[PDB]
Amino acid sequence: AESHWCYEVQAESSNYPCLVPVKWGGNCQKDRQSPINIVTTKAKVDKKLGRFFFSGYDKKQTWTVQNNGHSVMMLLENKASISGGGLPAPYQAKQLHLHWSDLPYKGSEHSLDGEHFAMEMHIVHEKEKGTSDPEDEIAVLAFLVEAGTQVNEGFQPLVEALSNIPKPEMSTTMAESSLLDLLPKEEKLRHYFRYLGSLTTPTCDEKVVWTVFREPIQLHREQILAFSQKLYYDKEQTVSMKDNVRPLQQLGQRTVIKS
Ligand SMILES: CC(=O)/N=c1\sc(S(N)(=O)=O)nn1C
Numbered sequence: 368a369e370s371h372w373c374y375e376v377q378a379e380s381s382n383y384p385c386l387v388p389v390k391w392g393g394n395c396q397k398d399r400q401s402p403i404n405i406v407t408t409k410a411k412v413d414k415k416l417g418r419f420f421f422s423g424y425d426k427k428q429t430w431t432v433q434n435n436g437h438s439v440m441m442l443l444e445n446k447a448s449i450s451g452g453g454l455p456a457p458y459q460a461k462q463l464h465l466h467w468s469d470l471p472y473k474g475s476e477h478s479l480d481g482e483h484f485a486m487e488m489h490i491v492h493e494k495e496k497g498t499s500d501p502e503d504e505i506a507v508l509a510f511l512v513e514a515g516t517q518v519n520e521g522f523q524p525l526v527e528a529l530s531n532i533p534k535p536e537m538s539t540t541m542a543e544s545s546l547l548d549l550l551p552k553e554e555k556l557r558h559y560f561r562y563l564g565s566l567t568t569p570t571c572d573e574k575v576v577w578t579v580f581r582e583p584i585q586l587h588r589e590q591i592l593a594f595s596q597k598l599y600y601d602k603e604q605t606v607s608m609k610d611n612v613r614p615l616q617q618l619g620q621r622t623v624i625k626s
């Protein structure tokens with residue numbers, strides 16, 4: 368590898384050389400990659416995909432949030448977990464991070480019926496294994512974010528914290544908030560899409576069971592813009608953090624199912 372991985376926007380916005388997505392190493396060139404476009408009418412209903420159970424999602428916490436140089440990430444340190452969702456085990460929550468742009472019609476990694484959303488939020492969980500690595504070691508819950516004029520009060524603690532972590536490796540503490548504050552209303556999360564894929568940054572390991580919820584989070588345009596306005600890819604603050612999005616990958620011979 369001749370330089371550090373980057374997103375296209377970083378290569379375009381700086382003279383410092385870096386490895387763009389089509390040139391990424393690791394497992395990034397293998398054939399079960401994410402994100403993908405989901406043709407919603409072609410995903411078959413699987414009745415075994417029931418409701419999710421969220422643990423620790425309703426509890427108010429003061430989360431640590433940090434700029435890791437390619438996103439903003441909340442550290443969930445196993446303080447939450449999930450089960451159900453047609454998942455084979457409970458999964459422990461590790462981190463939450465986001466991908467975004469500064470235009471309403473792009474910013475998501477996945478697309479639904481060829482539509483990208485303003486952001487996409489990933490909550491990353493790790494499988495509770497038994498004795499008897501796997502294709503489903505990691506469960507990522509993906510939520511699409513739609514831009515509008517509705518102020519999302521739940522997001523405010525996160526949005527306000529952004530001012531405090533402009534540069535990579537900076538961390539801060541968010542005001543009291545729960546994970547549910549960040550999500551659509553729980554009852555609306557019964558409809559989701561499911562497929563097997565990869566992590567969307569190097570080394571892009573093919574060990575993710577993906578869930579993409581049908582119901583979008585509503586965020587005000589200016590709450591979304593706060594991400595590109597307050598954050599930077601680099602300590603020199605030369606490239607505002609936005610378009611931290613991997614281009615679409617081919618489904619190949621994989622199948623997408625839905626609840
Ligand atoms: C270690 C870890 O969780 N990193 C991640 S989370 C992730 S993502 N964007 O959720 O698929 N991609 N990568 C590389």
Ligand SMILES: [Zn+2]
Pocket residue numbers: 464465466489567
């Ligand atoms: Zn992600």
